[PDB]
């Protein structure tokens, strides 16, 4: 659970079947399994809410490497089909949690940010971040210089 | 002709319905589309006396719709009257193609990958009709577009912050520049 | 008959007005200015303020005529679809007062003109065909509801991601090129919808960036500057000659 | 206010009375309206009739 909450570590869902389903193969407490996954029309919805977890939370771990992906690769990474991909694309785009834009002129599309919405921000971010770094540079290069030239 | 409150019929109006024709025959050109709905949708004071004339209302709502074969129909009605109404005979030639391009602008403002088939639904056989029609709309300084034959491209374009609004200043103040410069060169000798 | 009600209008406003104390047919003339002049497409709310005057003059009136004296204005609330006086008309007692069955029809007319779901509308199209019997113009009353419901559907479907294939955004209407292309291009022409459609590859793409005052305000003020310099050209042509 | 013994040598006058309009109070048919509006602020069970006291 908690290792699946931080970056979710794109595991096998049948190893999730192992973990969360051999709890019924417990010669001890099964009242966790009975309360959580012993339910059927709530517990099956929890199984597919955990398929909703793999799509939901793993789109939120894959949201870094986008602005370039096709659709087949997103099927090959979300650990499901392209039809399950499009159904999950539907319910997560009506979620509209992070701004999606999907299109099938050839299929190169993704869940996305607002798609680099600005002009000169690149000059600001790149050149002023890097150059105010380069102006803090000399101010602590004199630091390093004096501290190492005390001795040698 | 905006006002329309004080001109019911004086001794100067042998037909106020000809004033209704005069306001439609220029409102179809000059009036913008929010202005179009603002005049003949938001208000009825001309729309009673032209709801006695439904094809005028029909033509303005089709102008509000973009259906084009009835533009051919009712624009031909207006052009029959444009030959058969005075103060129009030195002037009718601009009208036909001007209303046509007044529809063609929003026609191309629909989208970009357009054809002459989906437009031939609205045009009939507008295939080599639109040859001379749209080509001389291109060569009349009008209708910013690109058009192809067999790849059959259409183009909608011109964002206003591009080059010409940047250009018009020195367009004025080069002839204006050397004008005021020579006006400041009469001063020496 | 609107020209018969027009000759009757031009006879009413001076002949019925030539009969002293008419607070009775003047409200009839209010309904007439709310059906004829809204049939002259004047405004929902001017004609519906005349329906407001009619609605506050429809009391102490007999029951099989006050049972149908609200049909015009409530099937016009079906026309309105920005109903705007639910809280005053149909919460009011004139829609909650009478014994007959037509006010029991106008109750669900009121609640449906409050909610307006397709699951209620296209299903009670057959339940309101006998209530389409009392429709005086068979276009605008339902057409504002469903031709608003067009762009209702569109903002339900086009909104969550901008660029799209035309075919699957048009799968929920099942027509690819008949009228939804005209509707979306019309919302381009009405600036409810900012983007570019397609016919070749069938790819709609929404985007926009109109305002640049760095270009606009500057260059148009330079145009005004050049007009002012042309206005100084006569100080120039006056000092010269 | 309630009492009217304060002016009209100068408020409501020949010439001054261009929109200076005398304002009395409302007739019968108005208590019904107040009963309709202010009791619509409460919840109104579904049937406790209201013209029984006008």
List of chain A residues whose C-beta atoms are within 8 Å of the C-beta of residue C205: 103
Of C42, C200, C230, the CB nearest to B44: C42
Please state, in angstroms and rounded to a whole number, the distance separating the CA atoms of residues A51 and D19: 73
CA angle (C127 as vertex; C90, C59 as ends), nearest 5 = 30
Which strands sit side by side in the sheet containing C195-196, from one edge to the other? C164-165, C203-206, C195-196
- State the CB neighbour count (10 A cutoff) for residue B144: 13
CB of C197 less than 8 A from some CB of B: yes
- In DSSP terms, C197 is beta-bridged to B111
Tell if the CB–CB gap between C201 and A103 is shorter than 8 Å: no
Residue among C55, C62, C91 nearest D39 (CA): C91
Residue C206 DSSP label = E
The residue of chain C with its CA nearest to that of D46 is C96
- State the CB neighbour count (10 A cutoff) for residue C48: 24
Please state, in angstroms and rounded to a whole number, the distance separating the CA atoms of residues C48 and C55: 10
**For an interface test with C, which of B36, B49, B161, B186 has the most C Cβ atoms less than 10 Å from its Cβ?**
B161
Query: What's the gap in Å between the CA of C240 and the closest CA on chain B?
Result: 7
For C100-208, where are the alpha helices, taking DSSP H only? 102-115, 118-121, 140-157, 166-169, 180-189
Tell me the helices (H) and strands (E) count for chain B, helix number first: 8, 0
Question: Which of residues 195 through 214 in chain C touch A, CB cutoff 8 A?
Answer: 201, 203, 205
Neighbours of chain C (3+ CB pairs under 8 A): A, B, D
Of B160, B172, B183, the CB nearest to C226: B172
Beta-carbon pairs below 8 A across chains C and D = 4
Q: Return the C-alpha torsion angle D18, D22, D28, D32, nearest 10.
A: 80
Task: Say what the resolution is, in angstroms.
Answer: 4.9
Tell if the CB–CB gap between B166 and C201 is shorter than 8 Å: no
Beta-carbon pairs below 8 A across chains B and C = 89
Left if phi > 0, otherwise alpha if psi is -120 to 50, otherwise beta: which for D15? left
Backbone angles phi, psi at C196, to 5 degrees: -130, 130
B138 Cβ neighbours under 8 A, 6+ residues apart: B145, B147
Contact by Cβ (8 Å): A113, A100: no
CA distances from B68 to B102, B121, B154 (A): 12, 9, 18
Neighbours of chain B (3+ CB pairs under 8 A): C
Question: Which of residues 11 through 30 in chain D touch C, CB cutoff 8 A?
Answer: 29
CB of B63 less than 8 A from some CB of C: no
**For an interface test with C, which of A104, A110, A118 has the most C Cβ atoms less than 10 Å from its Cβ?**
A104
Helix (H) or strand (E) holding B40: helix B33-40
C93 Cβ neighbours under 8 A, 6+ residues apart: D36
Report the length, in residues, of chain C.
241
Of B44, B114, B168, the CB nearest to C199: B114
Of C43, C188, C209, the CB nearest to B109: C188
Angle, helices C140-157/C180-189, rounded to nearest 10 degrees: 80
Contact by Cβ (8 Å): A92, A100: yes
CB of A115 less than 8 A from some CB of C: no
- B30, two tokens: 């000059």
| CA C56 distance to own-chain centroid | 23
3 state DSSP class of A37:
coil
Contact by Cβ (8 Å): A81, A75: yes
Task: Say whether the C–A interface has 3 or more Cβ pairs within 8 Å.
Answer: yes
Please state, in angstroms and rounded to a whole number, the distance separating the CA atoms of residues A92 and A90: 6
List of chain B residues whose C-beta atoms are within 8 Å of the C-beta of residue C201: 113
Please state, in angstroms and rounded to a whole number, the distance separating the CA atoms of residues B22 and A99: 51
């Amino acid at each position: 659970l908690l290792k699946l909450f931080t970056t979710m570590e794109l595991m096998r869902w049948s190893t999730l079947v192992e973990d969360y389903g051999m709890e019924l193969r417990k010669g001890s407490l099964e009242s966790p399994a009975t309360d959580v996954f012993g339910s059927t029309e709530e517990g099956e919805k929890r199984w597919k809410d955990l398929k909703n977890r793999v799509v939901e939370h793993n789109i939120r771990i894959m949201a870094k490497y986008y602005t370039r992906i096709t659709m087949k690769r997103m099927a090959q990474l979300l650990d499901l089909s392209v039809d399950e991909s499009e159904a999950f694309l539907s319910n997560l785009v009506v979620n509209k949690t992070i701004f999606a834009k999907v299109d099938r002129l050839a299929g190169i599309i993704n869940f996305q940010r607002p798609k680099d919405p600005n002009n000169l921000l690149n000059d600001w971010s790149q050149k002023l971040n890097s150059l105010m770094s380069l102006v803090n540079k000399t101010t602590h290069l004199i630091a390093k210089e004096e501290m190492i030239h005390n001795l040698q | 002709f905006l006002d329309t409150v004080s001109t019911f019929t004086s001794y100067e109006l042998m037909d106020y319905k000809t004033f209704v024709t005069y306001t439609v025959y220029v409102s179809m050109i000059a009036l913008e589309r929010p202005d179009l709905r603002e005049k003949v949708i938001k208000g009825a004071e001309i729309l009673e006396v032209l709801h006695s004339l439904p094809a005028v209302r029909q033509y303005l709502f089709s102008l509000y719709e973009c259906r084009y074969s009835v533009f051919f129909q009712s624009l031909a009605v207006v052009e029959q009257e444009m030959k058969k109404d005075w103060l129009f005979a030195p002037h009718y030639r601009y009208y036909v193609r001007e209303m046509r391009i007044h529809a063609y602008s929003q026609l191309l403002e629909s989208y970009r990958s357009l054809t002459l088939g989906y437009m031939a639904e609205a045009f009939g056989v507008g295939v080599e009709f639109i040859d001379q029609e749209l080509s001389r709309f291109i060569a009349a300084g009008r209708l910013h577009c690109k058009i192809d034959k067999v790849n059959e491209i259409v183009e909608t374009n011109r964002p206003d912050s591009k080059n010409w609004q940047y250009q018009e200043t020195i367009k004025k103040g080069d002839l204006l520049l050397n004008r005021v410069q020579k006006l400041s060169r009469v001063i020496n000798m | 008959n609107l020209p018969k009600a027009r000759a009757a209008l031009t006879s009413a406003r001076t002949t019925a007005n030539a009969i002293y104390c008419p607070p009775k047919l003047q409200a009839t003339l209010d309904m007439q200015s709310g059906i004829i002049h809204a049939a002259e497409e004047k405004d929902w709310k001017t004609a519906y303020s005349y329906f407001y005057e009619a609605f506050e003059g429809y009391d102490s009136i007999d029951s099989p005529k006050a049972i149908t004296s609200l049909k015009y204005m409530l099937l016009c609330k079906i026309m309105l679809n920005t109903p705007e006086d639910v809280q005053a008309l149909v919460s009011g007692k004139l829609a909650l007062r009478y014994a007959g069955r037509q006010t029991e029809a106008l109750k669900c007319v009121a609640q449906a003109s409050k909610n307006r779901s397709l699951a209620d509308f296209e299903k009670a199209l057959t339940d309101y065909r006998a209530e389409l019997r009392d429709d005086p113009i068979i276009s605008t009353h339902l057409a504002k509801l469903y031709d608003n419901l067009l762009e209702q559907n569109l903002i339900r479907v086009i909104e969550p991601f901008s660029r799209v294939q035309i075919e699957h955004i048009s799968s929920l209407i099942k027509l690819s090129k008949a009228d939804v292309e005209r509707k979306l291009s019309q919302m381009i022409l009405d600036k409810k919808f900012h983007g570019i459609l397609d016919q070749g590859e069938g790819v709609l793409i929404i985007f926009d960036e109109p305002p640049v005052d760095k270009t606009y305000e500057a260059a148009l003020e330079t145009i005004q500057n050049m007009s002012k310099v042309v206005d100084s050209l006569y100080n120039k042509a006056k000092k010269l000659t | 206010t309630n009492r009217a013994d304060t002016l009209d040598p100068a408020l409501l006058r020949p010439g001054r009375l261009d929109r200076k309009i005398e304002f009395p109070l409302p007739d019968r048919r108005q208590k019904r309206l107040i009963f309709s509006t202010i009791t619509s602020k409460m919840n109104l069970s579904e049937e406790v009739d209201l013209e029984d006291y006008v």
